[PDB]
Amino acid sequence: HKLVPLAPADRAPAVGQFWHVTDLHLDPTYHITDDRTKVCASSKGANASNPGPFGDVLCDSPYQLILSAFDFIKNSGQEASFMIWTGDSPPHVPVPELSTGTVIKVITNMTMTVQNLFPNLQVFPALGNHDYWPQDQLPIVTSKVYSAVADLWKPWLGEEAISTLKKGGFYSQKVASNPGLRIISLNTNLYYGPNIMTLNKTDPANQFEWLENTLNSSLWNKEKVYIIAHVPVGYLPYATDTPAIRQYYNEKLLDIFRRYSSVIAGQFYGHTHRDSLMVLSDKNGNPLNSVFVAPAVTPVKGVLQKETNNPGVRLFQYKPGDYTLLDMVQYYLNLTEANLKGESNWTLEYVLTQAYSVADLQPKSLYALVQQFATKDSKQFLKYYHYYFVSYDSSATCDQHCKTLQVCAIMNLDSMSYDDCLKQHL
Ligand SMILES: *[C@@H]1O[C@H](CO)[C@@H](O[C@@H]2O[C@H](CO)[C@@H](O[C@@H]3O[C@H](CO[C@H]4O[C@H](CO)[C@@H](O)[C@H](O)[C@@H]4O)[C@@H](O)[C@H](O[C@H]4O[C@H](CO)[C@@H](O)[C@H](O)[C@@H]4O)[C@@H]3O)[C@H](O)[C@H]2NC(C)=O)[C@H](O)[C@H]1NC(C)=O
Ligand SMILES: *[C@@H]1O[C@H](CO[C@@H]2O[C@@H](C)[C@@H](O)[C@@H](O)[C@@H]2O)[C@@H](O[C@@H]2O[C@H](CO)[C@@H](O)[C@H](O)[C@H]2NC(C)=O)[C@H](O)[C@H]1NC(C)=O
Ligand SMILES: *[C@@H]1O[C@H](CO[C@@H]2O[C@@H](C)[C@@H](O)[C@@H](O)[C@@H]2O)[C@@H](O[C@@H]2O[C@H](CO)[C@@H](O)[C@H](O)[C@H]2NC(C)=O)[C@H](O)[C@H]1NC(C)=O
Ligand SMILES: *[C@@H]1O[C@H](CO)[C@@H](O[C@@H]2O[C@H](CO)[C@@H](O)[C@H](O)[C@H]2NC(C)=O)[C@H](O)[C@H]1NC(C)=O
Ligand SMILES: [Zn+2]
Ligand SMILES: [Zn+2]
Ligand SMILES: [Zn+2]
Ligand SMILES: [Zn+2]
Ligand SMILES: [Zn+2]
């Protein structure tokens, strides 16, 4: 009778779970019509290829598609303690067809959709490069869009988070359901090539200084951190020697992450609309940090592209109170199948540990996997390349040059190591 906190009953080890959704790209104009050049503004005058109620590969997301993704989550039977949402809500239309008010309108719509369906779920958003008007021009001082999302996302964020969000589009925030876990939501659009507003700035919106201080505080307060952002660090895996953010910023951000690798238990990005892994390593090739790029809900592609993604959403498993990543479950919609019969069947695509026969998502485990990808005719890599497009096309092939680009980007996030990998493997 000493009022002792009740000790857990010895049982099978519980795991925590959270959702990651990204790149919704709602197109409010979507509607089926005979003139296929009028199905969606986002096809920019192209004929929709084969449109249905859940969308088209040349179009951004019909509302019904986004709705079906969130209804799948809600009825999935999966318990989750939070969700990360890494941005990009307006669709791909020319700048003159949007405005600041319209951008805010679409972000509001996506935010309220989530809040209505998931009223008890803490959500951690990050801004995407399309979450501003004109696109990509995210500023280094406060702005209407920053002020708007600060209000929209107040239910999820504390006063501190709201203040930094309003100033620069970034924040950190303790996870109410998970003591000892902090989310750091970066505005990596400040580092994105097309952003005129940050040309020649060594530390736009002071995000690097803020990030270094935030991580140091977490290190000393014994927290763990999940980093989330829209545009990823590292190299585009389909292009040669092309960093996803400006090289100066990539190198500087990576050095921070390497220095605080003991505190960072995960990094989660979108923007590419593909399913990609990266492993941050030191200069000598030792793995330090696992990086997960998540595919988009939208299936949009340009006419010039051959492949695109199926819609996807994903879920992570972690060790409770510790926050080590245990597994990832990717879900998807076979878009063609769903448009043909008119009914969504969001379903399991793969479970990372089972697909690749790894114990967990720790850097050394993923590093060992990717050194398998490097082997000639690796069946593991073939699977990875199938999932890269979220199983859009099992006959898509990756020739020697393509695979070199993929594997080099998976393993080498900084310029010196990426270039050395090209020297050895081109
Ligand atoms: C998401 O959902 C879609 C639609 O259900 C699935 O796509 C279908 O997949 C099946 C099986 O993979 C395909 O059936 C086979 O197609 C092969 C031809 O490939 C292309 O060529 C046709 C030619 O008209 C194109 O129209 C089309 O785009 C195909 O991509 C054929 O070789 C097969 O014929 C053989 O099948 C059996 C033998 O096993 C025999 O019955 C036949 O006589 C013959 O020997 C077969 O036709 C089907 O074409 C696909 N449909 C579409 C619209 O692409 C995806 O697989 C699914 N995604 C995932 C991840 O499962
Ligand atoms: C968009 O498509 C229209 C319609 O073309 C037809 O439908 C397509 C889905 C496909 O089946 C084509 O083979 C068809 O021709 C295009 O307009 C057609 O263009 C050709 C060439 O002038 C002509 O034979 C048709 O009569 C045209 N119109 C119709 C109603 O068929 C239109 O050019 C396409 N737009 C773009 C930007 O590609
Ligand atoms: C990172 O933080 C350490 C720890 O300092 C503490 O950090 C928080 C707990 C907060 O409460 C701060 O006010 C604390 O001081 C810093 O280490 C300090 O370094 C200074 C020299 O600059 C030294 O005089 C102090 O004695 C150190 N404190 C301890 C406890 O060792 C460190 O400077 C910070 N690193 C960076 C890059 O800012
Ligand atoms: C987000 O936008 C969608 C589409 O613009 C809204 O859904 C439509 O709302 C109007 C009602 O004003 C109806 O006429 C349509 O039939 C609705 N459905 C579709 C598929 O267009 C949706 O209500 C908006 N959500 C929020 C929270 O504002
Ligand atoms: Zn996007
Ligand atoms: Zn884009
Ligand atoms: Zn983007
Ligand atoms: Zn080449
Ligand atoms: Zn280079």
Cα separation, 315 vs 327, whole angstroms:
8
Does the annotation flag 132 for ligand binding? no
Please report the atom of ligand 4 found closest to the CA of residue 28.
5
CA of 288 to the centre of ligand 3 (A): 24
User: Which residues, 6 or more positions from 184, have their beta carbon under 8 angstroms from its beta carbon?
Assistant: 170, 171, 172, 211, 214, 215, 225, 226, 227, 228
Report yes or no: 327 and 310 within 8 Å, Cβ to Cβ: no
Cα separation, 394 vs 383, whole angstroms:
9
Residue 247 exposed, middle or buried by CB count within 10 Å (0-12, 13-18, 19+) = middle
Cα separation, 225 vs 184, whole angstroms:
7
Residue with CA nearest ligand 3 atom 4: 220
CA of 35 to the centre of ligand 2 (A): 9
Cα separation, 295 vs 254, whole angstroms:
22
Please report the atom of ligand 3 found closest to the CA of residue 212.
37
Question: What backbone torsions phi and psi does residue 66 show, to the nearest 5 degrees?
Answer: -65, -45
Does the annotation flag 130 for ligand binding? yes
Residue 110 exposed, middle or buried by CB count within 10 Å (0-12, 13-18, 19+) = buried
User: Which residues, 6 or more positions from 273, have their beta carbon under 8 angstroms from its beta carbon?
Assistant: 23, 295, 296, 298, 300, 308, 309
Can you give the three-state secondary structure of the chain, one letter per residue?
CCCCCCCCCCCCCCCEEEEEECCCCECCCCCCCCCHHHCCHHHCCCCCCCCECCECCCCCECHHHHHHHHHHHHCCCCCCCEEEECCCCCCCCCHHHCCHHHHHHHHHHHHHHHHHHCCCCEEEECCCCCCCCCCCCCCCCCCHHHHHHHHHCCCCCCHHHHHHHHHHCCEEEECCCCCCEEEEECCHHHHCCCCHHHCCCCCHHHHHHHHHHHHHHHHHCCCEEEEECCCCCCECCCCCCCECCCHHHHHHHHHHHHHCCCCEEEEEECCCCCCEEEEEECCCCCEEEEEEECCCCCCCCCCCCCCCCCCEEEEEEECCCCCCEEEEEEEECCHHHHHHHCCCCCEEEEEHHHHHCCCCCCHHHHHHHHHHHCCCCCHHHHHHHHHHCCCCCCCCCCCHHHHHHHHHHHHCCCHHHHHHHHHHHC
Please report the atom of ligand 1 found closest to the CA of residue 395.
30
- Termini Cα distance of the chain: 71
360-375: burial string, b at 16+ Cβ within 10 Å, e else:
bbbbebbbebbeebbe
Residue 221 identity: N
Q: Which of 63, 102, 106, 110 to mutate to test the pocket of ligand 4 (most atoms within 8 A of CB)?
A: 63
Sheet containing strand 276-281, strands side by side = 171-174, 181-185, 224-228, 264-269, 287-293, 276-281
User: Which residues, 6 or more positions from 333, have their beta carbon under 8 angstroms from its beta carbon?
Assistant: 54, 65, 68, 69, 310, 311, 312, 344, 345, 346, 347
Beta bridge partners of residue 332, listed in sequence order:
312, 347
Rounded to 10°, the helix 63-74/100-117 angle is 30
User: Which is nearest to 186 in space by CA: 219, 152, 223, 212?
Assistant: 212
Q: For residue 423, give the ligand nearest its CA.
A: 9
User: Which residues, 6 or more positions from 4, have their beta carbon under 8 angstroms from its beta carbon?
Assistant: none
Task: Enumerate residues lining ligand 4, CB below 6 A.
Answer: 28, 63-64, 109, 112-113
Report every protein residue that has its C-beta within 5 angstroms of ion ligand 5: 23, 88
How were these coordinates obtained? X-ray
Report the relative pairing of strands 82-85 and 312-318 from DSSP bridges: unpaired
Domains within the chain, CATH numbers bracketed = 16-422 (3.60.21.10)
166-198: burial string, b at 16+ Cβ within 10 Å, e else:
bbbbbbbbbbeebeebbbbbbbbbbbbeebebb
CA of 31 to the centre of ligand 2 (A): 19
Does the annotation flag 360 for ligand binding? no
CA of 24 to the centre of ligand 1 (A): 28
User: Which is nearest to 26 in space by CA: 117, 101, 116, 87?
Assistant: 87
Could you give the C-alpha distances from 264 to 19, 313, 399, in angstroms and in order? Answer: 18, 23, 35
Sheet containing strand 82-85, strands side by side = 122-125, 82-85, 16-21, 312-318, 325-332, 347-351
User: Which is nearest to 283 in space by CA: 259, 315, 307?
Assistant: 259
| Residue 50, CB-side half-sphere exposure with 13 Å CA sphere | 8
Report yes or no: 90 and 106 within 8 Å, Cβ to Cβ: yes
220 close to ligand 3 (CB < 6 Angstrom): yes
CA of 283 to the centre of ligand 5 (A): 31
Instruction: For tokens 């790149």, name the residue.
Output: 23
Residue 206 exposed, middle or buried by CB count within 10 Å (0-12, 13-18, 19+) = middle
CA of 258 to the centre of ligand 1 (A): 46
User: Which is nearest to 135 in space by CA: 193, 186, 84?
Assistant: 193
Residue 112 exposed, middle or buried by CB count within 10 Å (0-12, 13-18, 19+) = exposed
